[PDB]
A paper describes a structure:
In summary, the structure and electrochemical properties of [name] are consistent with its possible role as an electron shuttle between MtoAB on the outer membrane and a range of potential electron acceptors on the inner membrane. Further analysis of the sedimentation data gave a f/fo coefficient of 1.24, indicating that [name] behaved like a monomeric globular protein in solution.
The crystal structure of [name] was solved to an initial resolution of 2.29 Å by single wavelength anomalous dispersion (SAD) using the anomalous signal caused by the single iron atom contained within the heme group. The initial model was used as a template for molecular replacement to obtain a final resolution of 1.47 Å. The crystal structure contained residues 28–119 of the processed amino acid sequence and a single c-type heme covalently attached to Cys43 and Cys46 via thioether bonds, consistent with the histidine ligands predicted from the sequence alignment. The imidazole side chains of the two histidines coordinating the heme iron are arranged near-parallel relative to one another, at an angle of approximately 35°. One obvious difference is that the axial coordination of the [name] heme is bis-Histidine, while other crystallized cytochromes have Histidine/Methionine coordination. The class 1 cytochromes typically contain a flexible loop that covers the front of the heme, however in [name] this region is restrained by a hydrogen bonding network that causes the formation of a β-loop and prevents the peptide sidechains from interacting with the heme propionate groups. To date the heme group of [name] is significantly more exposed to solvent than the heme of any other structurally resolved monoheme cytochrome, suggesting that the properties of the heme are likely to be extremely susceptible to changes within the local environment. The measured redox potential of +155 mV for the [name] heme is high for a bis-His coordinated heme and the heme group is significantly more solvent exposed than in monoheme cytochromes. Previous studies on the potentials of the heme groups of MtoA indicate that they span a mid-point potential range between +30 and −350 mV, which is lower than the potential of [name] and indicates that electron transfer from MtoA to [name] would be thermodynamically favorable. This supports the hypothesis that [name] could be the electron transfer shuttle between the outer membrane MtoAB complex and the cytochrome bb3 oxidase on the cytoplasmic membrane, allowing the efficient generation of a PMF.
Residue numbers in the entry: 28 to 119
Amino acid sequence: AVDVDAAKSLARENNCFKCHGVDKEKDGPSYKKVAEKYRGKADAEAKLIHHVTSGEKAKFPDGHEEEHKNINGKASPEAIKNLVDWILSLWS
Ligand code: HEC
């Protein structure tokens, strides 16, 4: 079961909410929209764990790109999984 407080704590600590809201878009997509994009995908969790631990290109609204925030080695595997699992749940 997702630990919601631990997920939101990890997000705060790693600047995630500076660019993402739960329901409101900012620099990055809302997590509700992400959850919708990935709803049902069998490999959703692995894909988002990959996304947050690789630093691949992230295209911004104004057209510029940056390597995405990479938290590999900055928290535990269990904490990262729990944060992904929280995100994926936010479609409802
Ligand atoms: C602003 C500087 C950002 C910070 C800090 C973080 N994210 Fe981000 N993220 C951002 C952008 C601009 C995008 C869109 C990239 C694109 O090319 O479309 C994203 C995307 C995500 C996603 C969706 C990935 C996908 O496969 O659809 C997730 C789940 C996500 N970002 C999570 C996330 C987390 C957990 C962060 C803190 C560790 C974080 N982001 C920081 C911009 C920014």
